[PDB]
Design a protein around this ligand. Structure first.
Ligand SMILES: C#CCN1C(=O)[C@@H](C)N(CC2CC2)c2nc(Nc3cc(F)c(O)c(F)c3)ncc21
Length: 320
């Protein structure tokens, strides 16, 4: 159903003017439309923005909007890129938000960057494998994103290929989306206690042991989720993938494989052929306490030794 008239001009809270175009991806992702700056020209298929629209009473869009307003300000992101000497940062840029009435109902809208394909479509097109080169290059950039959001008091809790999108104009740049169930683990620098939060489940195959135990996600959980993603991307499989309707089984399997990472490597890889950097990554994440700040540069260094081992380097090429 129609939130906007096609081609309509909408003004955000900061009085910036935008034009609304057609819904994205045959309406497969819900109420998300192409958007551009207000101009005499119609919004084309090459629009640089999207507008997401939900009823004002939608909890997830409010959570997401708050994350975006607090940590995705364009200048704020650019400053981080400059000061950390990054090529880019995969955190979508926030362009504005407002309230829009239609048919006597109140809607919230948010203007964000427009990306290309999600990684899950590309993964499936590649018979559910990424090369070691691709996985190490993806994971280095996701460690940059996680360090960023963690340093801005948030954890994502749901890293996966469907939440990773390529830059529309650059296929070597990957961005992490979906902050609707993101968790502010450290409001004003005070870490949440090890307990439930009045609900961040995550995706069952990739979620953290912390999440399965019913506690609020923290930084170690995000790094654990990326670990499971890396194995899924390399091998096409996870050991517990046939028992995804039994959370108890999934949690039990993850707990057992955390206690014995050698047995996880033996299970997931051909005998005697497991990538050492994946094992070292999981061993390092296992050592994190619930409230502990990760050493993100140590984790990047572990993955860089992986690139050295295959005769490569971090040249920012995702090889997709
Ligand atoms: C056209 C086109 C391509 N395209 C898709 O095919 C699918 C994968 N999606 C939807 C995303 C959710 C999976 C897209 N999302 C966005 N922007 C965007 C979405 C967000 F959710 C968000 O928070 C944000 F900051 C920006 N641009 C383009 C697409």
């Amino acid at each position: 159903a129609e939130q906007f008239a096609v081609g309509e001009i909408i003004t955000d809270m900061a009085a910036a003017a935008w034009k609304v175009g057609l819904p994205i991806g045959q309406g497969g992702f819900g109420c998300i439309y192409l958007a551009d700056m207000n101009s005499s020209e119609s919004v084309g298929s090459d629009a640089p923005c999207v507008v997401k629209v939900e009823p004002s009473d939608n909890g997830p869009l409010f959570t997401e909007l708050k994350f975006y307003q607090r940590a995705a300000k364009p200048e704020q992101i650019q400053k981080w890129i400059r000061t950390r000497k990054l090529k880019y940062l995969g955190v979508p840029k926030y362009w504005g938000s407002g309230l829009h009435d239609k048919n006597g109902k109140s809607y919230r809208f948010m203007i964000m960057d427009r990306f290309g394909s999600d990684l899950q479509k590309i993964y499936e097109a590649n018979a559910k494998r990424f090369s070691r080169k691709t996985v190490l290059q993806l994971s280095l950039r996701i460690l940059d994103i996680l360090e960023y959001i963690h340093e801005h008091e948030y954890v994502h809790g749901d890293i996966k290929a469907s939440n990773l999108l390529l830059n529309y104009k650059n296929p070597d740049q990957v961005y992490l989306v979906d902050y609707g169930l993101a968790y502010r683990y450290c409001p004003e620098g005070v870490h949440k206690a090890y307990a439930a939060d009045p609900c961040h489940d995550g995706t069952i195959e990739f979620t953290s042991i912390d999440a399965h135990n019913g506690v609020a996600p923290s930084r170690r959980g995000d790094l654990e989720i990326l670990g499971y993603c890396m194995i899924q991307w390399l091998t096409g499989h996870l050991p517990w993938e046939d028992n995804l309707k039994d959370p108890k089984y999934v949690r039990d399997s993850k707990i057992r494989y955390r206690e014995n990472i050698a047995s996880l490597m033996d299970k997931c890889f051909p005998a005697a052929n497991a990538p050492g950097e994946i094992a070292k990554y999981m061993e390092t994440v296992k050592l994190l306490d619930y409230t502990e700040k990760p050493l993100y540069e140590n984790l990047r260094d572990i993955l860089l030794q992986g690139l050295k081992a295959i005769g490569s380097k971090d040249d920012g090429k995702l090889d997709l």
